[PDB]
Design a protein around this nucleic acid. Sequence first.
DNA 1: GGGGTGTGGTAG
DNA 2: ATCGCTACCACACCCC
Length: 437
Amino acid sequence: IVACDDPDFLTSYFAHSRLHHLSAWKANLKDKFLNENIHKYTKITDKDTYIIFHIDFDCFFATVAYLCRSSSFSACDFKRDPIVVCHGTKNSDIASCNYVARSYGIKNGMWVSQAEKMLPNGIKLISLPYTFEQFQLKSEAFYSTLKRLNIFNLILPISIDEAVCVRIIPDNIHNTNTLNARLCEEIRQEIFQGTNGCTVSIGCSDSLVLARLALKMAKPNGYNITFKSNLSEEFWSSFKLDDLPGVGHSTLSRLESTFDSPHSLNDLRKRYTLDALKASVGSKLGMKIHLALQGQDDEESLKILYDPKEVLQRKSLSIDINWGIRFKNITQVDLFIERGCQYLLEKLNEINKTTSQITLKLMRRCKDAPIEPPKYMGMGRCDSFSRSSRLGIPTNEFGIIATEMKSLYRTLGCPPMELRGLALQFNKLVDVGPDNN
DNA sequence: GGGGTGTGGTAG
DNA sequence: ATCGCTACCACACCCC
Ligand SMILES: [Mg+2]
């Protein structure tokens, strides 16, 4: 048990944190892509007609945790039993759940406590531990398999278990549904074999946005092919409003108030006008939804196809620790900030780049929130405070950055005992070049 | 036309 | 117990 004033805390937290793991795995895939395309111009161009194959493991952690489960769980049955992956028994996040679990209304991000109430009497919830290293090995087999198929002109990592795979179509070839259905089936069988039993679903279209919706429609363990040509009312009626890219709970809520609670993308499509939509959720998001409702990608999302090296290139660097934060005095806060800065500078020197602007953000207990929140070591209900600082010269010097970071903390005025969360960010990065005179 | 900062949504 | 990250965009509002 590692307290936040222990020099080992960051290492233990990050080793246990599935969200940290997902972020680092994602950054590593993006750097790997860059280091492999330092010479290629494998880009998509305006002259290219292309098909999108958007691929994603089904209930990834739960599948892998099951395939690699310990002998204590030998008798657990992935097709019969409700299965979650999590650390604990109560206010512990469900990181993944199998489709047995989901059939009872369990969803990712639920606490185990809430999930247990959703089961009928007599049905027991199976809780598997994380298998982080094997999560990564299955991801290697995934990406290895996609490259070996030699059917994609461009392979874009979205995450450890999800990729957007681009196939250029010569106008010498006439596109058909049967041919894309056969590719989908090959991809699914080769990944199933290559990962020793994980399954993927696949959305296939002539736009990124349709391919992502088709993928949602295709789950679980299936595929769906919906081109712009094939759009119909049954397609749009299949999706909730927050299935759209960039529509979360907050945008969802605004769309409902504005348009009298549409219950499907079809309802939204029939009621909206671009004007009122921009007024509801903003000019850029509104245009994006409007484009999305015609099955069309926006200019921003298309850049990943025409310039993936620039899209995937890292523009900032940060850590966020909003769990386990309980400090008694300012001395312990300063030491934790120094540790965070050290960690971040190891990451910064890995990619050979200086930083010109830093930010400290923190979470502070709401004046009326309990000192000890419902979730053990959780941040609870908090107010956010943030402040940034331009560095004179771009630097990687600990003495400069750490001092400024500790200074930033003092400017935000948070008493150490009220602190519940800390983010440390390098907001602008400058390349290091061969001439340093 | 350019530049800025803090806050906050979303993704996956 | 329990591991509530992190990159990126968009906004409201401010300066010249
Ligand atoms: Mg959404």
